[PDB]
Homo-oligomer: A and B are copies of this chain.
Amino acid sequence: PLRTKAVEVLQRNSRGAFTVPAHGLYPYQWLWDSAFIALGWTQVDWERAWQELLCLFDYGQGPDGMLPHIVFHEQSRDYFPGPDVWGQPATSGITQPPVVATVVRYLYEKDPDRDRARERARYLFPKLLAFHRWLYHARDPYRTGLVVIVHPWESGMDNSPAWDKPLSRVPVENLPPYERRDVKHVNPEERPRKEDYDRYLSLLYLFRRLEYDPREIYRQSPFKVVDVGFNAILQRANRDLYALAVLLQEDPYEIEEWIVRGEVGLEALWDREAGFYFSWDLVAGEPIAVKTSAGFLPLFAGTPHQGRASLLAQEAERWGEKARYLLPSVDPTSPFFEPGRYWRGPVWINVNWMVAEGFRDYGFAALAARLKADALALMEREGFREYYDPLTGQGRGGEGFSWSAALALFWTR
């Protein structure tokens, strides 16, 4: 049965203190993955759920508060207690959507062991706060209330069609050849193309040349985008961090400013003519007029009014006129729709979950139930995969994919 098989996936992908998103393909700890995965662990062991996030901060967080999207843990034997019991990993230099405070609030409020909850939350709170502070200091220099991503990887939605035009400005001349490894695990037709990776690496090399300095990265990056997904997730996380601060009796004045200015910013991304939220390209100084599943995420933030939520509900229904399974990652009528290729059409369980949560919060119970039912149907028939073809339901991407298993467990708790 579903829950039993989901637990098997999480335990197989566990490395003790963290969970790989998928064996082989993603053999390290990822930031937003660990946050979703921790919700799954609440169905197995509460301590284990906390440990996922302790590990992320303890081994990932940099001295300036930055939380990187990958912690490159060295491979260990799946045995405890090993020689290190009887007797500092590298990280990436970019971030990912900051869903972690939302998960921490949930762990804090619902852990049946209240002494443990207080100990873990008090430990993590100043670390979360330092991460959020880094985001505004490094990525919102104009005090807008919106944070900028400098790499499409930071959206978590690597090859979203939203990033096509911004990425077209990234130089690739004299880029040395490099060796792809994702193609050992996943068919290239389901992955970003060569032209995408060329530009992913060009950006990396620029940042590395700049010694990962925030000021020069902001000024020099040829990719500067206000991602609706990243920002909706940050607004939600700020609201949840505020609640933690009050419950723990810390001063949240700083967080209140982020919330209020962020509400203004996130609502600015709404395009009335399109009836949808768009990411913005700050190099071109233009909205990116591509409707992706990320544009539903302000529901999860809780910023729109009901009318606006109702227009999104209509749009989700429209996408459902063309795809059997909600929610495709891009509008199925978009000329960029590719039903098998990663973030250009396939259904993702984490986004179904966040968007169902948002719709529920706005009273759209039928739509929330549909998003759940489709997610669970996909996993029942095809197992725990990274994404699914919205037309056929076929599994795609990573096999034994952790957040799919995790959210199967969480959603059916």
Residues of A within 8 A of B (CB): 109, 114, 118, 142-146, 226, 239, 242-243, 245-253, 256, 259-261, 264-265, 267-268, 272, 280, 282, 284-287, 302, 304-311, 357, 360-364
Whole-angstrom distance between the alpha carbons of A238 and B364 in the complex? 31
Whole-angstrom distance between the alpha carbons of A286 and B246 in the complex? 10
Given contacts A109-B286, A114-B284, A308-B363, 13 further A-B contacts (CB under 8 A): A142-B245, A142-B252, A144-B245, A144-B246, A246-B265, A256-B261, A256-B264, A272-B360, A272-B361, A302-B305, A306-B363, A307-B361, A307-B362
The residue that A242 contacts in the complex, of B253, B256, B264, with Cβ under 8 A, is B264
Per assembly, the copies of the chain total 3
Query: Which residues of chain B are near A272, meaning CB under 8 Å?
Result: 357, 360-361
Pairs A–B under 8 Å by Cβ, sample size 24:
A109-B286, A109-B287, A142-B246, A142-B250, A143-B253, A143-B256, A144-B251, A239-B264, A242-B265, A247-B282, A247-B287, A249-B285, A256-B264, A259-B264, A267-B302, A272-B360, A302-B305, A305-B305, A305-B309, A306-B307, A306-B363, A307-B309, A307-B361, A307-B362
Whole-angstrom distance between the alpha carbons of A309 and B249 in the complex? 29
Query: Which residues of chain B are near A251, meaning CB under 8 Å?
Result: 142-144
Q: Is the CB of B260 within 8 A of A242?
A: no
Whole-angstrom distance between the alpha carbons of A252 and B265 in the complex? 10
Closest to A359 in B: B307
Closest to A251 in B: B142
Query: Which residues of chain B are near A264, meaning CB under 8 Å?
Result: 239, 242, 256, 259-260
Query: How far apart are A155's CB and chain B's nearest CB, in angstroms?
Result: 18
Q: Known interface pairs A311-B363, A361-B308. Does A268 touch B253 (Cβ–Cβ under 8 Å)?
A: no
Q: Is the CB of B285 within 8 A of A247?
A: yes
Q: Is the CB of A310 within 8 A of B363?
A: yes
Closest to A310 in B: B363
Whole-angstrom distance between the alpha carbons of A143 and B287 in the complex? 33
Query: How far apart are A289's CB and chain B's nearest CB, in angstroms?
Result: 9
Query: How far apart are A276's CB and chain B's nearest CB, in angstroms?
Result: 13
Whole-angstrom distance between the alpha carbons of A362 and B306 in the complex? 7
Q: Is the CB of B252 within 8 A of A144?
A: yes
Query: How far apart are A49's CB and chain B's nearest CB, in angstroms?
Result: 16
Whole-angstrom distance between the alpha carbons of A33 and B16 in the complex? 59
Query: How far apart are A218's CB and chain B's nearest CB, in angstroms?
Result: 10
Whole-angstrom distance between the alpha carbons of A12 and B305 in the complex? 43
Whole-angstrom distance between the alpha carbons of A109 and B274 in the complex? 12
Closest to A358 in B: B307
| A226, A265, A307, A310 — most chain B CB neighbours (10 Å) | A307
Query: Which residues of chain B are near A144, meaning CB under 8 Å?
Result: 245-246, 251-252
Query: Which residues of chain B are near A260, meaning CB under 8 Å?
Result: 260, 264
Q: Is the CB of B286 within 8 A of A114?
A: yes
Whole-angstrom distance between the alpha carbons of A308 and B145 in the complex? 25
Closest to A252 in B: B144
Closest to A106 in B: B273
Query: How far apart are A34's CB and chain B's nearest CB, in angstroms?
Result: 22
Query: Which residues of chain B are near A247, meaning CB under 8 Å?
Result: 280, 282, 285-287
